[PDB]
Design a protein around this ligand. Structure first.
Ligand SMILES: Nc1nc2c(ncn2[C@@H]2O[C@H](COP(=O)(O)OP(=O)(O)O)[C@@H](O)[C@H]2O)c(=O)[nH]1
Ligand SMILES: [Mg+2]
Lengths: 66, 424
């Protein structure tokens, strides 16, 4: 019986710890995937704007030949 | 053997225990300070059983007060006879147990239990011959229920040859604090089946009913119940505290009340039920005492059969009338007494009556009807368990459904065994 008691309280400690741990993981995965996603979006936006810039240089060059 | 060691665990436990110490301290002439101030010698002849003598006459209840919350025990230190208790013997945590059996038994209680056992050793080692221990608790909360049973085990590990005795309050929907009470009860009934020699089953249901439909108290308080309780506890501890013919011990009681090891669950009864200028007649006391409307359980003895019975008669009356009426109750209703245990109703008389009363009768029954109490609980338990309700509170403390399953089975079995003997 004493061993059973030690096992039960051990189970409780382990289960709370596993909770805190799985929480910490899940949250880190989420924060990191969010940061990767947001950065990707802003990168593609700035790159669209860069292609806009390159086409403006293209236009100016096309006129300085006419 | 002589000295008893008394333990109060939990709210209900410390409440009924504090009342009990008030009541019998009065009976024994001990003022709230520990000084004897009574007339008779009878009051001090066996005072060693429940009180340790100290310093200038001072008597100190050999009691250990235990709780996981500081409330009820502060309440006790504060109130009437509050400082008759050895201050060292207050052992308390701060967390509480949240009416959770798992918490009192496995997690929070486990922290506190070793300091309790420390005080237990200190008292036991200062005894000439320790009979055993008496515990007060409910089975429906968390501290009393779970921590108390854990203590029962611990103490049995350390004193396997002594007697375990409990006044255990059974829960009832009529008087409920939490829905998990059936679980808690079924868990500790399990422990009690295995680790006590004698448990007085004090059912809150009966105390309610007797408060409501007899004392005619429409709105009963826990004090109303606890006055019935302290009356019973004085009653059934009398022959252990007073000299006389059948100088009683806890073991002889067990030997004389427990035909089979597991069936050690007793039904107490008391007359006259109070809440009294006219003393009754022996006939009255007797018949009141054996009626159900005076049982502190809930079961009707006419539904099963007395295995063993002990009656105590307190006051000044004729022993001839006492013997006549006792044999009249048996000979008349000889159907409700098993025929394979000959001469199973014993009777004692003590001259000192309880406070307020001039004549009184207490009664202790090993009756098969207790199965009803257990059955009630089993049902309530099952209902919830069948849909695994409110189990998270326990599972989150490390427990498994298997434990519950086992417990249930055991109680079911108990009932069965009891029935087996009702048909014999
Ligand atoms: N008769 C009686 N029953 C009580 C008292 N206090 C609580 N109960 C019952 O005991 C159970 C609650 O347990 P409680 O003693 O408060 O919890 P604990 O402190 O964890 O052990 C419920 O079944 C209540 O009905 C009391 O003072 N007298
Ligand atoms: Mg409570």
């Amino acid at each position: 019986k004493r061993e059973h008691e030690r096992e039960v309280i051990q189970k409780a400690i382990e289960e709370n710890n596993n909770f805190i741990k799985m929480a910490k993981e899940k949250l880190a995965q989420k924060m990191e995937s969010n940061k990767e996603n947001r950065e990707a979006h802003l990168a593609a936006m700035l790159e669209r704007l860069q292609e806009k810039d390159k086409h403006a240089e293209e236009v100016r060059k096309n006129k300085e030949l006419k | 053997m002589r000295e008893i060691v008394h333990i109060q665990a939990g709210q209900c436990g410390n409440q009924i225990g504090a009342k009990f110490w008030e009541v019998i301290s009065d009976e024994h002439g001990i003022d709230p300070t520990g000084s004897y101030h009574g007339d008779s010698d009878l009051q001090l002849e066996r005072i060693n059983v429940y009180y340790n003598e100290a310093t200038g006459n001072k008597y100190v209840p050999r009691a250990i007060l235990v709780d996981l919350e500081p409330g009820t025990m502060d309440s006790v230190r504060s109130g009437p006879f509050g400082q008759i208790f050895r201050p060292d013997n207050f052992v308390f945590g701060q967390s509480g147990a949240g009416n959770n059996w798992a918490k009192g038994h496995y997690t929070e209680g486990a922290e506190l239990v070793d300091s309790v056992l420390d005080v237990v050793r200190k008292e036991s080692e200062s005894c000439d011959c320790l009979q055993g221990f008496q515990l007060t608790h409910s089975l429906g909360g968390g501290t009393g229920s779970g921590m108390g049973t854990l203590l029962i085990s611990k103490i049995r590990e350390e004193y396997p040859d002594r007697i375990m005795n409990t006044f255990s309050v059974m829960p009832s929907p009529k008087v409920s604090d939490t829905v998990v009470e059936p679980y808690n009860a079924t868990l500790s009934v399990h422990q009690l089946v295995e680790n006590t020699d004698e448990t007085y089953c004090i059912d809150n249901e009966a105390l309610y009913d007797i408060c409501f439909r007899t004392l005619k108290l429409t709105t009963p308080t826990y004090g109303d119940l606890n006055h019935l309780v302290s009356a019973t506890m004085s009653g059934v501890t009398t022959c252990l505290r007073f000299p006389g013919q059948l100088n009683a011990d806890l073991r002889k009681l067990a030997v004389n009340m427990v035909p089979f090891p597991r069936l050690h669950f007793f039904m107490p009864g008391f007359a006259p039920l109070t809440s009294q200028y006219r003393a009754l007649t022996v006939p009255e006391l007797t018949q009141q005492m054996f009626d159900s409307k005076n049982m502190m359980a809930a079961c009707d003895p006419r539904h099963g059969r007395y295995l063993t019975v002990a009656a105590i008669f307190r006051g000044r009356m004729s022993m001839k009338e006492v013997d006549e009426q006792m044999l009249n109750v048996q000979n008349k209703n000889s159907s409700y007494f098993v025929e394979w245990i000959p001469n199973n109703v014993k009777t004692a008389v003590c001259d000192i009556p309880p406070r307020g009363l001039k004549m009184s009768a207490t009664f202790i029954g090993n009756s098969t009807a207790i199965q009803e109490l257990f059955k009630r609980i089993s049902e309530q338990f099952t209902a919830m368990f069948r849909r695994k309700a409110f189990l998270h509170w326990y599972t989150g403390e490390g427990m498994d459904e298997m434990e519950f399953t086992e417990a249930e089975s055991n109680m079911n079995d108990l009932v069965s065994e009891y029935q087996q003997y009702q048909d014999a």
